[PDB]
Amino acid sequence: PDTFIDERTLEVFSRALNPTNPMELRNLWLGRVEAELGDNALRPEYADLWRRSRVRRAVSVEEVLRSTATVGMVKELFNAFFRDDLYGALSSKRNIILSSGAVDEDEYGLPAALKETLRFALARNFYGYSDSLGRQPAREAVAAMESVSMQQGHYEAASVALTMGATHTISSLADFIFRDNPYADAAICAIPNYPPLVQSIAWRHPVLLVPTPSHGGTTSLQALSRAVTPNTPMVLLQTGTNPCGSLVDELELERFIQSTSLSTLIILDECHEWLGAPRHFSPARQRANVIRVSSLSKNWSVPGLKVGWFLADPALVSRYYEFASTSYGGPQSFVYTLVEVLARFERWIIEGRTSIDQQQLREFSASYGLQLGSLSQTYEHYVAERRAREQVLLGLRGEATSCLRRASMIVKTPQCSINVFAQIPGSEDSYLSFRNVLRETGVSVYPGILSFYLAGGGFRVTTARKWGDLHRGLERLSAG
Amino acid sequence: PDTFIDERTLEVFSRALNPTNPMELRNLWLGRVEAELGDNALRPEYADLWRRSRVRRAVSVEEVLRSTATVGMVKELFNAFFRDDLYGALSSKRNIILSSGAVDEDEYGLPAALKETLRFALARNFYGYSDSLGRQPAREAVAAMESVSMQQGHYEAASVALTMGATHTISSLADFIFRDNPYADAAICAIPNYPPLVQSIAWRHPVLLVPTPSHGGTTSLQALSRAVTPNTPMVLLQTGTNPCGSLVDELELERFIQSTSLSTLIILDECHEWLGAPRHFSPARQRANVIRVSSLSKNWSVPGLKVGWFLADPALVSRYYEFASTSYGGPQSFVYTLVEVLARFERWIIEGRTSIDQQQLREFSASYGLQLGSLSQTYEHYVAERRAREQVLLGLRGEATSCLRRASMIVKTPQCSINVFAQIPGSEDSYLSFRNVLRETGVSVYPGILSFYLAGGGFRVTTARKWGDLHRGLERLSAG
Ligand SMILES: NC(=O)c1ccc[n+]([C@@H]2O[C@H](COP(=O)([O-])OP(=O)(O)OC[C@H]3O[C@@H](n4cnc5c(N)ncnc54)[C@H](O)[C@@H]3O)[C@@H](O)[C@H]2O)c1
Numbered sequence: 004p005d006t007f008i009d010e011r012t013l014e015v016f017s018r019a020l021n022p023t024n025p026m027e028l029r030n031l032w033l034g035r036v037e038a039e040l041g042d043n044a045l046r047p048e049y050a051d052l053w054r055r056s057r058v059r060r061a062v063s064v065e066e067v068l069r070s071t072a073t074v075g076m077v078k079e080l081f082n083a084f085f086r087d088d089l090y091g092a093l094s095s096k097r098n099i100i101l102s103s104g105a106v107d108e109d110e111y112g113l114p115a116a117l118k119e120t121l122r123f124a125l126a127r128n129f130y131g132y133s134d135s136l137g138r139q140p141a142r143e144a145v146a147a148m149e150s151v152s153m154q155q156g157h158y159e160a161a162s163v164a165l166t167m168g169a170t171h172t173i174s175s176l177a178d179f180i181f182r183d184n185p186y187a188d189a190a191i192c193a194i195p196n197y198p199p200l201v202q203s204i205a206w207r208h209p210v211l212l213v214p215t216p217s218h219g220g221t222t223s224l225q226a227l228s229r230a231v232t233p234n235t236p237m238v239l240l241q242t243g244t245n246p247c248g249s250l251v252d253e254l255e256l257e258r259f260i261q262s263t264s265l266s267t268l269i270i271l272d273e274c275h276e277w278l279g280a281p282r283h284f285s286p287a288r289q290r291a292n293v294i295r296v297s298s299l300s301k302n303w304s305v306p307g308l309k310v311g312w313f314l315a316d317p318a319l320v321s322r323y324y325e326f327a328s329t330s331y332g333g334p335q336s337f338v339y340t341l342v343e344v345l346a347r348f349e350r351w352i353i354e355g356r357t358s359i360d361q362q363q364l365r366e367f368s369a370s371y372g373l374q375l376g377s378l379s380q381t382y383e384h385y386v387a388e389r390r391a392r393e394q395v396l397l398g399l400r401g402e403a404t405s406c407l408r409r410a411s412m413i414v415k416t417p418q419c420s421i422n423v424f425a426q427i428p429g430s431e432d433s434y435l436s437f438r439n440v441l442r443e444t445g446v447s448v449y450p451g452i453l454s455f456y457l458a459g460g461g462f463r464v465t466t467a468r469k470w471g472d473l474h475r476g477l478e479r480l481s482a483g
Numbered sequence: 484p485d486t487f488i489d490e491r492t493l494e495v496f497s498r499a500l501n502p503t504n505p506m507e508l509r510n511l512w513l514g515r516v517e518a519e520l521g522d523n524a525l526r527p528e529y530a531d532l533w534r535r536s537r538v539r540r541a542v543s544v545e546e547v548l549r550s551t552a553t554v555g556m557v558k559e560l561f562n563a564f565f566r567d568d569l570y571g572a573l574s575s576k577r578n579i580i581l582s583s584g585a586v587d588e589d590e591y592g593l594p595a596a597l598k599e600t601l602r603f604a605l606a607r608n609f610y611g612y613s614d615s616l617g618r619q620p621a622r623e624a625v626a627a628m629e630s631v632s633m634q635q636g637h638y639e640a641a642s643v644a645l646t647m648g649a650t651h652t653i654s655s656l657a658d659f660i661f662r663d664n665p666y667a668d669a670a671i672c673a674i675p676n677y678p679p680l681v682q683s684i685a686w687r688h689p690v691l692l693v694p695t696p697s698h699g700g701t702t703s704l705q706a707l708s709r710a711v712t713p714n715t716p717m718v719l720l721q722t723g724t725n726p727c728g729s730l731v732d733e734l735e736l737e738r739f740i741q742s743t744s745l746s747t748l749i750i751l752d753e754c755h756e757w758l759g760a761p762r763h764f765s766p767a768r769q770r771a772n773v774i775r776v777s778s779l780s781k782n783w784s785v786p787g788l789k790v791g792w793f794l795a796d797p798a799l800v801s802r803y804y805e806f807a808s809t810s811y812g813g814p815q816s817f818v819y820t821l822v823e824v825l826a827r828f829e830r831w832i833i834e835g836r837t838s839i840d841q842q843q844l845r846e847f848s849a850s851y852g853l854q855l856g857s858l859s860q861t862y863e864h865y866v867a868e869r870r871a872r873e874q875v876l877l878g879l880r881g882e883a884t885s886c887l888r889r890a891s892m893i894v895k896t897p898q899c900s901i902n903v904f905a906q907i908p909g910s911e912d913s914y915l916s917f918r919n920v921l922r923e924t925g926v927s928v929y930p931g932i933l934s935f936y937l938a939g940g941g942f943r944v945t946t947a948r949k950w951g952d953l954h955r956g957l958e959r960l961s962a963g
């Protein structure tokens with residue numbers, strides 16, 4: 004069963020001088036981890052700090068999940084992991100990085116059809132000022148793409164707002180939602196989640212953390228449904244769960260969505276709902292209080308392009324126009340052609356189209372100068388490249404699951420995305436396991452504490468790497 | 484003399500039902516403008532609303548400049564200008580756009596050397612996750628570029644934080660500064676300014692508007708210096724003033740900077756300090772409380788790329804790392820090569836280098852595969868392209884000033900940037916002049932009310948357009 008918090012987590016919060024301070028909590032958490040590393044402690048200053056700590060209060064489970072310091076402490080550990088541990092003191096060229104959580108851009112990158120649209124925008128000087136919500140033909144293409152996946156209903160361009168990635172989208176949404184929001188109940192964030200997203204929400208409003216366990220690759224929203232109140236301002240939930248790779252059932256999601264008041268905005272993080280997800284969305288996903296956020300960083304492996312959008316009610320998108328104009332002025336006009344081509348190519352794939360006639364070419368404008376022969380060949384090669392990428396990534400995920408289970412390690416079966424969650428038997432600290440595995444085997448893994456797994460010793464393994472690196476990393480994981 | 488506010492501005496605020504409401508103020512301002520348009524009123528609903536309004540309070544000059552509704556009203560007029568008037572109801576393909584305020588990307592675009600670095604990043608798949616403050620070699624190049632322009636002192640890579648444009652930078656800075664800022668005095672924004680920047684600051688803290696008049700192309704900070712208090716949280720000021728094109732004297736800026744306490748952060752908007760500006764910065768610009776914000780949107784004419792950075796104290800940049808990671812995760816990794824090449828090319832130009840030896844090539848890494856022959860030719864052609872662009876833009880600005888003065892219109896002589904501020908004699912409303920000029924001549928101009936010129940009827944004319952469009956626009960301006 005999934006473990007989210009236990010008595011070991013409460014020990015750090017109980018000995019803190021100031022439990023509200025996120026820096027003191029991070030130092031104690033790092034101090035305890037480095038105390039177990041007797042002769043292998045990287046920073047002995049924190050190890051002595053934990054030794055001198057003394058229990059001075061009683062901490063309950065409810066206190067930890069309702070504290071903004073818990074989100075802050077995890078985010079500080081998130082910061083210390085990258086710039087202080089993985090790419091800082093312990094940075095090495097001989098390390099095998101299995102903790103990135105992103106698809107290898109050099110091996111599995113953007114398709115050549117989509118890279119051609121970026122060179123086309125460069126040649127046409129398509130990098131001027133544009134609308135705050137995005138160019139209108141780009142939004143129209145996105146709406147058509149999202150409509151064919153719905154069981155019933157369609158989407159309009161007034162429901163689409165292009166943004167600069169999912170991290171910026173949710174951060175922008177939280178600031179926009181909590182301007183003068185009358186509802187004073189704590190915002191609900193479902194864990195496991197992404198610390199940058201949770202910390203951004205904790206910036207504006209107090210946050211309640213609700214565990215969302217998974218059983219057999221199925222994400223359970225039973226605990227989430229009970230915690231949601233009629234006065235809840237917002238809810239952040241992943242349809243495809245990270246790091247375990249579990250997936251939310253459509254009927255359970257539909258029942259949970261329909262059981263909430265219209266004043267409770269539901270943010271659906273759909274960045275991991277791919278590579279095995281049956282994307283047949285119920286009409287409840289188009290409810291007035293539902294906001295669907297997606298990004299190109301994982302599915303198309305372009306995190307450095309900062310391209311994304313969200314779907315909401317047309318009245319909400321109209322209000323967001325004023326926020327986007329002031330906050331950043333508008334999205335990237337350089338990638339408007341890429342978004343329009345991506346949305347129309349994906350929509351044709353869902354409809355099962357194999358060849359392109361004059362009807363599909365007429366969807367694009369005449370200013371592009373598209374030809375029937377060139378567009379048809381481009382789309383067919385795009386389909387083959389996307390299907391090939393899906394099969395290789397599925398094979399790597401399955402191969403990693405079997406190889407890592409052969410090393411007598413408890414592994415949860417993934418249902419979507421590119422991540423596999425595993426745990427060495429007898430491990431109780433996820434950050435300590437990262438330090439131990441990196442020192443002995445030389446492979447870096449993503450600790451579960453960075454995924455809001457306050458308890459347990461499981462870690463995330465990213466299987467969407469080059470086969471040469473992935474095989475070597477798995478080989479030393481079994482040997483170690 | 485410059486007029487910022489008068490009795491005509493106070494009339495709108497006095498008749499408002501709710502003076503705090505920005506929408507009511509915008510409707511009255513638009514209603515009065517459309518009341519003068521007897522048979523030419525675009526929306527007669529607002530014209531009747533102004534007629535029925537009655538005076539119900541007394542409004543002073545100090546009340547208008549200390550109200551967040553004044554910033555909101557101007558920003559609503561900013562929104563109504565673009566999506567409701569220029570590109571909405573009155574949108575037409577026969578209109579000549581002289582109100583964009585940006586360099587024509589199709590005619591005067593990014594240099595081919597800088598466009599080659601974007602195609603290089605595409606081929607090398609340089610669109611992955613990166614540091615929250617930017618890639619280290621990119622920041623090192625920027626610091627070297629900024630150091631050669633200083634009269635004394637140098638910059639380090641710890642003082643550089645890459646961001647996604649100036650609008651996003653100032654919006655991010657305002658949120659970062661006002662997290663738990665103890666100083667409760669009103670933030671000071673110098674007008675004329677950019678409504679998106681002022682509205683973003685008004686989001687976090689109350690704002691005081693301080694007029695910053697110009698005389699003979701010289702921006703006067705005498706009024707700004709008196710308004711600044713030891714408890715002032717932040718000050719937003721443009722070194723190159725928009726729309727008039729005036730410039731701040733270096734000695735006056737140095738005296739103003741050195742006369743402020745270290746607790747008053749000074750944001751220097753330097754996006755218009757080019758095309759005639761003597762960029763010889765005093766050491767006071769490197770003070771611990773000074774933040775220098777720049778962008779590539781105007782000087783390099785790439786607003787759609789969202790590329791920029793700011794310079795601050797190394798201690799402030801370190802704290803900003805946590806904010807950038809949560810707010811948006813980090814800057815655009817796709818443009819890292821462009822930033823590094825831009826910064827090193829500009830630094831060589833300032834030093835007066837004409838040829839490239841092995842010493843300059845060694846500054847770049849060996850992973851780029853740069854050759855001595857190719858790099859030297861690329862830099863020399865980049866210098867010629869940048870110098871050619873400067874001369875044509877200067878000629879268009881000078882030609883527009885003389886031709887538009889020949890039409891018996893009061894024109895302020897510009898000292899920098901690409902904008903020229905003019906006023907038809909007898910005009911008292913800037914927005915009305917925009918409606919009248921667009922209806923008769925067919926040329927669109929940028930009203931001064933959108934530049935926080937609450938009084939007067941002057942408008943901004945953008946001279947950085949194609950000569951065919953600029954000449955036709957000037958010809959119908961004189962005829963009309
Ligand atoms: N000019 C300003 O200072 C300013 C400021 C704020 C908002 N705006 C917004 O600018 C918009 C201007 O729109 P528009 O009439 O240029 O049309 P548009 O919205 O179709 O295109 C705007 C710009 O997007 C870029 N672009 C990128 N990919 C493109 C593609 N495939 N096809 C066409 N353009 C592409 C080009 O630079 C183009 O000029 C308005 O909606 C306005 O509200 C302008």
Ligand SMILES: NC(=O)c1ccc[n+]([C@@H]2O[C@H](COP(=O)([O-])OP(=O)(O)OC[C@H]3O[C@@H](n4cnc5c(N)ncnc54)[C@H](O)[C@@H]3O)[C@@H](O)[C@H]2O)c1
Nearest residue numbers: 085086090103608609610611612613614618816817819820
């Ligand atoms: N992987 C993650 O999920 C994640 C999350 C948060 C932060 N980070 C940050 O990612 C960084 C990774 O740095 P790194 O070791 O890859 O080195 P780096 O910082 O030099 O390069 C990072 C990435 O930038 C891109 N890039 C763009 N232009 C480039 C150029 N000219 N040369 C090289 N790369 C270029 C590439 O995708 C490259 O892999 C760390 O600083 C880390 O803190 C990673």
